Amino acid sequence: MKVRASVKRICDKCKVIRRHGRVYVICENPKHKQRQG
Amino acid sequence: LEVIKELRAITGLGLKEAKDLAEKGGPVKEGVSKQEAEEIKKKLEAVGAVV
Amino acid sequence: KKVVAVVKLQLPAGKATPAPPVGPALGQHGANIMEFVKAFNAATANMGDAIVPVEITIYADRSFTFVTKTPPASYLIRKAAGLEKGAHKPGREKVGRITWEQVLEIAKQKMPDLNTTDLEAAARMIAGSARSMGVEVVGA
Amino acid sequence: TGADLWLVIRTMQERLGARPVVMQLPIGREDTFSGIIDVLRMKAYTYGNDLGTDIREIPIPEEYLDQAREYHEKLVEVAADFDENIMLKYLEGEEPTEEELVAAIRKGTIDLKITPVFLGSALKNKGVQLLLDAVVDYLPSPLDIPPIKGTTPEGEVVEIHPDPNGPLAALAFKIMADPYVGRLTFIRVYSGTLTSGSYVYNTTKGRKERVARLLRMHANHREEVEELKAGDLGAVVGLKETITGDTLVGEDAPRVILESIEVPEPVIDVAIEPKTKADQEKLSQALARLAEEDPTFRVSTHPETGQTIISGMGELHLEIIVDRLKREFKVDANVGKPQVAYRETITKPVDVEGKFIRQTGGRGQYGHVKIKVEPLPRGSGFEFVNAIVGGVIPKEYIPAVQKGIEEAMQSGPLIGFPVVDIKVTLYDGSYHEVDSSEMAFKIAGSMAIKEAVQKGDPVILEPIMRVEVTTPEEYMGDVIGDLNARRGQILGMEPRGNAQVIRAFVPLAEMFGYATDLRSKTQGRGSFVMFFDHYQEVPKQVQEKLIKG
Amino acid sequence: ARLVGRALELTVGFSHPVVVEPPEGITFEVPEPTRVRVSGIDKQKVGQVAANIRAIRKPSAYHEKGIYYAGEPVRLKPGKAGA
RNA sequence: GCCAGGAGGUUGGCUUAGAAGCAGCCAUCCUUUAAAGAGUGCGUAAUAGCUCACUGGUCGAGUGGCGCCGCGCCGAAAAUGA
């Protein structure tokens, strides 16, 4: 999931409180860490 | 007798404090809880409860 | 050693062995679980077998005390309708009808169980559950 | 680091249930160690430097002085469970002596119900002579050990009376190869007296053997004496046929065979195939020079194709073998994984034609047959159904017509494997009073079958096994994991001892050596077996990949 | 752990000893090896040090072993987790 | 957010080696209730467990959700110095 243009809201803990100007998707089990790159 | 059969304190476990006899007690009824009162109170024993 | 630990089980009169949750749930006990199957086997001898809830307590000196309850109405609706293995799917197939009395007697027999202690209430809980196992009811 | 006492005492009974009961205590944990207190004689033992050229018995520096007492009591306490003299003489007023306690404790130490806890770091010459003392004073003399057993030459088990003045009966054990003397055959006797320059009769192999010389092995040299008495232990020099697990007797002795029958099976089934054919012979030499020293594993050349099956109780085991192999004998062995036995089988009730006939005048043979060849569930049996109407095919051509089938079923139309559980049948054919030979209709049945399978959609069968695993609950769970994550599905479970069985279906292909894989989801504490039941269709995707050239 | 005089010393899951030492504004306080305490008078500069000792020895390791705030382990497999 | 109430029949029937709200197919509840589901995720080998849902307790003023526009922003790596 890391670095892919779909930074939705995957596992319902994952958040988009936009930082650095490139949305990350922040969760728990970090096989769920999508990124904007 | 009543330490290696019932009271699972094998023997040394239930009578390590036997220097001053640290064991006195037993429950009893009729037919249901009495059969161990014709044993606890009658089997070369003397923990005379109520019955 | 071990002290007082009241643990209950869910066992039918047919599997009499120290197998989970028979053993380790009552291992800290010395639970006479073969004197539980026996004192309860012939106890529910209104049919011979039946599946029944239980509750066995340890008191240190190898003391076991079990308290029991009745079988289910997921067997007193299927034994109340002539459905063999059951009735493949609820809101689908049909096998053997039930009526306004059969359901009433069923609701009766098991009074303190179900949920309420009002004959004109638990009977409703029965009036539903019959449908969820694949069988019709005769109304009027 | 991590040194203890307590924890050992805990996990001992948290895994087995055998009460320890103990004889000595540390002076400081990890490297905080100087000397050792004991609770036997109650003497403050202590060394000094690690090498232990400076031992001592200096006073108790306090600290644990009192603590010895409690467990000392406990020590003494358990002495009241055996020698019932120390019982009253500890629950009255007096003191238990330095002697009858040795017999209470040895009582417990031969009845197997207690476990005198001595420990220590002999890296640094500590804890040595103590455990030695305990060993002499407690360890089971070959006297009270309940006698071994050895069936008379009649068919009834007999006891060995370990008097060094009776019938000479002897067991053997460990088989080395010593470039000096040779086949070192490590033996422990039993009854009677073992002399030198005499003779022995190994009852097992029925061969009479010659004691070339006497042996025991010391720590620094060969102990060469003359006689080994009843139940004394050592080794005999010069003794051919004899291996491990035997029973020899005096040249004229009552002549019996000691029991000593054991059963640990080889779990993992490895395959080994070492290049050319120049190796196979040297491999014969290999498994030859094994078994006599290594009677623990099994060698069974795949009872269908090549590959000598090398099956052993552990991957390591198998690998020190695969290594000594490639070194001692040279065998450039390239270990692979076992093949499998697959079985052709159709799906749809297909009924085709198998003709023959050749007319060039004279004998050219006649043979037209059409048969039912219907299928059966993947466990039934080979069949045939005489559906002959008027005797069109003269019955006497039916025999070979069934084998032509049977031998055109040896190798199927696909991979070429024994077609099974395909209830054939028959029905309508033909003949000619002359041309119709036996082999002609043999070929009728044959070809008819071939067309029937080529067209009838033959799918591939594969062995489905019974894995039955022993395991303590936790591992059990994650092994349900492993098993169902090995293709086919499992079955059930039961609490056997401190364990939980695992009834299991398992296709051998995905199963290849589970022992080391077992010991990864059981982490060692698990056991199992593997067995068989029936054959089954692969879930499709393997019949498009296995179209191998 | 063993805070000698002014210096916090420790040899945890690492070879050599460690010397963690006081910065301006905040203060250490070792009760014993297994549960070190900190008198830090600067809520911002303190938590820095908190997560910095914790970063000195990152715990977890699938099961346990390490330093924890009030931290709770997150479970995974030992001699397993290796297909 | 904070303290807590967070049920019973049931193990829904199916199916499955077992499947309990948790593998899913048809599902398609009623009573005890001020509220508690044929159920949201975590957990399990299936349960147990964890937990949310709804309801009260505190608190004291605002609050989620849906359609729309303008500038943005990510998506956005190529070669002599900008």
Side-chain angles (χ1 to χ4, degrees), chain C residues 2-138:
Chain C
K2 313 162 186 76
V3 282
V4 300
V6 44
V7 189
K8 71 153 189 171
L9 294 185
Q10 29 192 329
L11 295 168
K15 203 267 306 166
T17 45
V22 177
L26 274 66
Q28 272 51 45
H29 181 157
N32 289 280
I33 28 65
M34 294 301 105
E35 198 76 297
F36 127 80
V37 173
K38 292 230 296 185
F40 132 87
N41 222 67
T44 83
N46 182 38
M47 200 276 284
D49 321 319
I51 306 189
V52 149
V54 77
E55 184 217 42
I56 320 96
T57 310
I58 157 196
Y59 310 96
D61 20 26
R62 195 138 285 181
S63 174
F64 71 115
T65 45
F66 50 96
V67 194
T68 45
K69 308 95 198 170
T70 55
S74 284
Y75 154 76
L76 285 199
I77 186 259
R78 199 208 49 172
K79 173 77 65 175
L83 324 173
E84 290 295 300
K85 96 157 284 189
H88 320 71
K89 234 111 62 59
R92 275 294 299 184
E93 289 188 81
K94 288 82 190 290
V95 172
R97 331 163 206 276
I98 340 167
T99 75
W100 260 74
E101 169 48 47
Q102 275 279 109
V103 75
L104 212 169
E105 221 178 4
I106 298 324
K108 290 166 67 73
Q109 306 305 90
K110 328 182 81 66
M111 282 128 117
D113 316 315
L114 281 214
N115 197 231
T116 177
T117 81
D118 186 277
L119 262 160
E120 298 209 42
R124 315 299 178 271
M125 189 238 95
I126 301 301
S129 302
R131 181 78 79 252
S132 175
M133 292 179 272
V135 76
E136 54 174 301
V137 194
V138 174

Side-chain angles (χ1 to χ4, degrees), chain D residues 88-123:
Chain D
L88 289 174
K89 296 193 309 100
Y90 120 87
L91 230 309
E92 279 190 304
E94 217 184 357
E95 52 92 49
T97 187
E98 206 179 3
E99 358 265 9
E100 59 193 345
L101 281 178
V102 189
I105 299 167
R106 190 182 181 100
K107 216 150 177 166
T109 329
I110 306 187
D111 312 339
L112 284 90
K113 318 272 182 65
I114 201 178
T115 309
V117 172
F118 337 80
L119 45 287
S121 173
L123 211 181

Side-chain angles (χ1 to χ4, degrees), chain D residues 60-346:
Chain D
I60 313 98
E62 230 70 10
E63 52 201 30
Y64 308 144
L65 169 63
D66 190 281
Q67 232 164 9
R69 299 322 196 286
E70 31 211 301
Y71 296 170
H72 185 46
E73 305 329 284
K74 315 198 175 174
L75 162 119
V76 172
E77 169 265 302
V78 197
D81 293 332
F82 288 85
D83 232 341
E84 58 217 6
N85 325 41
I86 291 100
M87 199 174 66
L88 289 174
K89 296 193 309 100
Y90 120 87
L91 230 309
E92 279 190 304
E94 217 184 357
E95 52 92 49
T97 187
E98 206 179 3
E99 358 265 9
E100 59 193 345
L101 281 178
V102 189
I105 299 167
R106 190 182 181 100
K107 216 150 177 166
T109 329
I110 306 187
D111 312 339
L112 284 90
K113 318 272 182 65
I114 201 178
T115 309
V117 172
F118 337 80
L119 45 287
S121 173
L123 211 181
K124 323 200 179 315
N125 308 79
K126 292 163 185 177
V128 194
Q129 313 176 266
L130 335 177
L131 192 65
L132 296 192
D133 239 285
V135 156
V136 25
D137 298 45
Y138 303 124
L139 273 279
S141 188
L143 202 59
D144 41 51
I145 296 277
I148 330 86
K149 291 245 162 295
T151 291
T152 76
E154 309 301 319
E156 46 177 321
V157 81
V158 90
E159 169 199 280
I160 288 300
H161 250 354
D163 181 30
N165 314 281
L168 173 55
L171 217 117
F173 42 97
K174 209 276 164 181
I175 310 308
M176 202 183 81
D178 174 68
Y180 302 87
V181 290
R183 195 184 181 102
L184 246 181
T185 49
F186 293 17
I187 79 116
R188 167 198 179 169
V189 222
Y190 274 154
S191 202
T193 300
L194 162 68
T195 325
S196 130
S198 301
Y199 252 122
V200 286
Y201 175 85
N202 197 341
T203 40
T204 295
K205 295 177 163 44
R207 173 78 115 79
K208 313 188 291 188
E209 277 265 42
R210 170 70 181 182
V211 45
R213 213 166 321 118
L214 211 290
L215 190 140
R216 271 214 210 90
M217 284 308 289
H218 218 299
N220 237 336
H221 79 305
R222 272 129 179 81
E223 202 191 25
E224 193 180 318
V225 280
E226 170 150 300
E227 26 211 75
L228 199 62
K229 291 210 159 52
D232 212 347
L233 306 86
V236 49
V237 181
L239 223 68
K240 279 73 222 295
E241 264 290 289
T242 303
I243 48 181
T244 127
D246 299 279
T247 295
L248 303 89
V249 289
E251 52 201 9
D252 284 50
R255 288 178 50 194
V256 299
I257 292 183
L258 279 337
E259 189 177 345
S260 189
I261 310 181
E262 307 93 353
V263 243
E265 222 190 80
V267 268
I268 293 192
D269 336 81
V270 201
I272 186 260
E273 282 162 300
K275 207 168 186 172
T276 73
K277 325 299 174 191
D279 282 23
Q280 220 267 52
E281 320 180 7
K282 300 167 176 285
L283 127 81
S284 308
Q285 249 63 59
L287 85 129
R289 233 107 249 178
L290 268 29
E292 294 193 84
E293 179 189 29
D294 196 317
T296 92
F297 64 165
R298 286 175 214 201
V299 176
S300 149
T301 309
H302 190 280
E304 294 289 65
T305 179
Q307 30 161 198
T308 329
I309 296 165
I310 172 83
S311 65
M313 314 172 305
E315 152 198 331
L316 301 188
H317 182 177
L318 294 143
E319 187 210 335
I320 19 184
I321 268 56
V322 158
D323 180 31
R324 262 227 276 204
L325 174 74
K326 216 154 168 284
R327 291 194 179 188
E328 269 55 59
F329 289 69
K330 185 116 62 179
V331 183
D332 194 294
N334 298 80
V335 277
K337 66 176 192 172
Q339 280 279 336
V340 219
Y342 339 92
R343 303 294 145 99
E344 318 266 66
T345 173
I346 63 171

Side-chain angles (χ1 to χ4, degrees), chain B residues 10-13 15-20, chain D residues 19 70 73-74 77 80-81 90-92:
Chain B
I10 313 177
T11 314
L13 284 65
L15 302 96
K16 224 180 188 177
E17 307 174 316
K19 294 106 187 308
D20 328 288
Chain D
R19 186 181 196 180
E70 31 211 301
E73 305 329 284
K74 315 198 175 174
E77 169 265 302
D81 293 332
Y90 120 87
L91 230 309
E92 279 190 304

